[PDB]
Ligand SMILES: COc1ccc2c(c1)[C@@H]1C[C@]1(C(=O)N1[C@@H]3CC[C@H]1CN(C)C3)Cn1c-2c(C2CCCCC2)c2ccc(C(=O)NS(=O)(=O)N(C)C)cc21
Ligand SMILES: CNC(=O)c1c(-c2ccc(F)cc2)oc2cc(NS(C)(=O)=O)c(OC(C)C)cc12
């Protein structure tokens with residue numbers, strides 16, 4: 001029966017509350033220049049004789065064509081807009097050389113001109129509306145450290161906490177026409193410029209609801225930009241879930257939403273009562289056309305909930321105080337890093353894993369040790385690497401890792417010890433399974449890596465001091481690494497990542 005959507009009073013009530021909050025948002029219509037500057041340098045070429053760089057640093061051909069696309073969006077409210085379907089080759093896969101089928105992910109996008117028009121009309125709404133509507137439930141406002149703080153405080157707030165994760169399997173292609181229209185109705189509640197209001201209506205009717213796809217066919221999958229798709233999915237999932245919490249009569253809910261991924265922390269009503277409540281929640285979500293991947297399970301320990309491939313775990317700082325942090329099973333991070341040891345990638349998953357999971361036993365002992373050893377050998381500590389973290393691609397120098405880690409995780413990230421036996425066992429058994437040397441070997445290797453870094457001075461010695469303080473018996477004190485704004489001077493006089 002594919003997608004069949006049934007909307008009730010709970011859904012309608014939550015939508016009114018969302019629209020009432022949306023009404024307090026005043027969003028601005030970006031000029032051609034403002035939108036052009038937001039174009040990524042490696043954004044796909046237009047079929048109209050220009051393509052990134054030209055748009056990015058303003059060009060007569062690019063700007064005048066994008067102004068005609070804009071005029072057409074304001075004047076035509078129904079003609080379907082075309083989208084291109086392309087195969088982007090896979091990174092962690094054996095790629096045929098001198099003939100063969102190339103493993104690839106498929107990407108669907110409108111012409112570059114349309115993409116800049118979408119930014120003019122929606123960038124300010126997508127970057128302001130979700131937080132204004134969902135508040136603390138909006139998952140993309142948090143750093144790993146702030147996210148864990150939010151979760152733990154929500155868990156501690158309950159008399160008898162219960163929590164569960166709910167994941168909607170492949171929604172990005174299966175997005176209903178209704179969901180797209182409901183999203184638009186929320187965006188329309190903002191204080192928009194009249195041209196924005198029309199452009200939003202045209203884009204939703206001509207592009208977002210569906211349209212033709214070419215190098216052909218017709219698509220009903222998301223053709224919006226990353227920021228637009230993210231906003232849409234999060235608002236839709238929040239709407240359906242907040243309504244489903246009411247239908248399931250869940251008490252004192254705290255939700256955390258990241259696109260299609262969600263977590264609810266509420267008050268337990270007893271084992272069998274909670275099991276019934278979750279069945280109720282799932283029935284409501286399924287009726288709202290958001291069925292689960294795996295049926296949700298009530299959890300009574302925060303550590304047992306897995307969401308966005310991660311779970312909360314405990315460690316202790318140097319003073320013995322409990323420190324909470326996000327971790328994950330290290331099999332895929334290690335397997336991808338093994339690949340990268342043999343072959344250079346444009347993603348540098350190892351570096352992204354060190355940044356996302358810096359407090360973890362496996363990122364500190366294995367990934368930092370192994371890659372600093374390689375960088376020392378190759379004399380490439382200074383070389384900025386392109387690193388993909390979630391959406392974006394960042395250029396990161398390994399020498400700036402202490403500063404980055406402190407910003408995202410806090411100073412405790414460098415002093416953690418007394419990790420949970422279960423967490424250690426997951427790491428240890430994983431090393432045995434993959435043929436990786438045990439943790440005792442990594443300590444020996446890190447003492448040598450730290451020594452070589454210290455001898456190099458500057459940022460290299462700060463990497464030695466902060467990142468490998470776990471490897472020495474006689475530990476250094478470790479004070480916060482000061483930001484350029486704290487020092488009260490320009491980033492030009494501050495080595496590495498300063499505050500830009
Ligand atoms: C499929 O999933 C995985 C996952 C992990 C590993 C492998 C495969 C690779 C099988 C192993 C291997 O033997 N390798 C050698 C060395 C590194 C890795 C990849 N490389 C292309 C060839 C076993 N093996 C893996 C890693 C990873 C390297 C990146 C950072 C994280 C650890 C190792 C790191 C050091 C040794 C280590 O030092 N082993 S040792 O002491 O027995 N010896 C000196 C080689 C062995 C490793
Ligand atoms: C809705 N779920 C969440 O927001 C997340 C949870 C979580 C895990 C267990 C729970 F019990 C509750 C939440 O863990 C995460 C880890 C990351 N990445 S990271 C490791 O880089 O921080 C994340 O960042 C991206 C997607 C923005 C979002 C979440």
Ligand SMILES: CCCCCCCCO[C@@H]1O[C@H](CO)[C@@H](O)[C@H](O)[C@H]1O
Pocket residue numbers: 093094095096097338339342343
């Ligand atoms: C160590 C475990 C991870 C695998 C590392 C090997 C990476 C495979 O990489 C492959 O190498 C071939 C030979 O140059 C190329 O022909 C392929 O295009 C490439 O995908």
Ligand SMILES: CCCCCCCCO[C@@H]1O[C@H](CO)[C@@H](O)[C@H](O)[C@H]1O
Pocket residue numbers: 152155156301302303312313314324
């Ligand atoms: C795995 C992450 C679980 C998060 C638990 C947050 C609640 C912490 O709770 C604390 O636990 C301590 C345990 O020794 C007790 O001493 C404290 O009294 C209690 O408030």
